[PDB]
Ligand binder design. Sequence first.
Ligand SMILES: [Ca+2]
Length: 127
Amino acid sequence: CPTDWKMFNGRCFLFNPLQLHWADAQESCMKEGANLASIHSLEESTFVKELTSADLIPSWIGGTDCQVSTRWFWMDSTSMDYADWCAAQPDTTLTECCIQMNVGIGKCWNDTPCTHLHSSICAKPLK
Ligand SMILES: [Ca+2]
């Protein structure tokens, strides 16, 4: 993997501490040939959590159901075969359609307004 990135299951990951809304976070990843990260297993979830410091900082990941409620998509076009929703989540309301991880005391996923500023996780295949 390139310098500051970390490898896991054929992909490289990076924690971007900069506070950005979802769209800016995705744009920031694209500048590096990446996408906000998709997560497909508890093993991957744990690996990414280890990139967010001892505080497990709330972070944007690349999933949303912003087009049609309840229809979730990852920006890297991989399948939605895993989720780590907090209790009662997701709300599926189009007004809070971007996935945020490391949310609350449970450090789980919560769909939230995409305009909120958060750190983020970027990922891209290993070359
Ligand atoms: Ca929510």
